Amino acid sequence: LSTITTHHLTVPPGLTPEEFQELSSSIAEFHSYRINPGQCSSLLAQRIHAPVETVWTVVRRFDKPQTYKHFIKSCSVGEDFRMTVGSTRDVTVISGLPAATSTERLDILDDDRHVTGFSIIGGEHRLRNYRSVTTVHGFERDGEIWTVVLESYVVDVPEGNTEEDTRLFADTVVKLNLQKLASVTETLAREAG
């Protein structure tokens, strides 16, 4: 039947053991899921040479995912949008197929603890019933400062797909978007303002 993910028990790629030891409690709290047959789940990590709040200022902008994600043709939130849990956005993904819309709901937004997350609630693409959580974490050593971003998801494996089929695709997309996040926020950090 259902099982618990083990992301919080091993070092994900792109994290050092030292970083993992500081983050294991956060991974248990925010990046653990109860999964069912036909679902898969992964945890990805990205080190960023910028302060936490600089990274968080970009991560938290639910209305502007194109600021750090690839393959976004457009994203609309409509008038009267407030940055509050329950809000939705309509994302049009660059897919090489006829353009549709992924409708996504903001599930979590904690500016104190630097946690956000969302669910895909409709849209006809390769990530059915996708739900993800992103957390942002600060590190220091001898006055030097960096950030780690953790992003996990659960998603349905489509009929005819292997788990590897779906997991490798979703991991690749998340990893590439985190690399964009790292580039964008490192530029913001180096330029101050």
* Residues within the interface to a copy of itself (CB under 8 A): 70-71, 73, 94-99, 126-127, 158, 160-162, 165-166, 168-170, 172, 176
* Minimum CB distance to a copy of itself, residue 17 (Å): 25
Separation of alpha carbons 122 and 125, rounded Å: 9
Nearer to ligand DHC, 52 or 118 (CB): 118
Interaction site with ligand DHC (CB under 6 A): 69, 71, 91, 93, 95-96, 102, 104, 120, 125-127
Residues 6 or more apart whose CB falls under 8 angstroms from that of 159 comprise none
Nearer to a copy of itself, 160 or 193 (CB): 160
Separation of alpha carbons 32 and 152, rounded Å: 8
Nearer to a copy of itself, 27 or 157 (CB): 157
Residues 6 or more apart whose CB falls under 8 angstroms from that of 143 comprise none
Nearer to ligand DHC, 47 or 180 (CB): 180
Cβ contacts of 23-30, under 8 Å, gap ≥ 24: 23/137, 23/148, 23/150, 26/135, 26/137, 26/150, 27/150, 27/152, 30/115, 30/133, 30/135, 30/150, 30/152
* Minimum CB distance to ligand DHC, residue 61 (Å): 14
Q: Which does 98 bind (CB under 5 to 8 A by kind): ligand DHC, a copy of itself, none?
A: a copy of itself
Nearer to ligand DHC, 47 or 126 (CB): 126
* Minimum CB distance to ligand DHC, residue 118 (Å): 8
CA distances from 45 to 16, 110, 158 (A): 10, 19, 25
Asked if 123 and 101 touch (Cβ cutoff 8 Å), the reply is yes
* Minimum CB distance to ligand DHC, residue 69 (Å): 5
By Cβ distance, which residue is nearest to ligand DHC?
A: 126
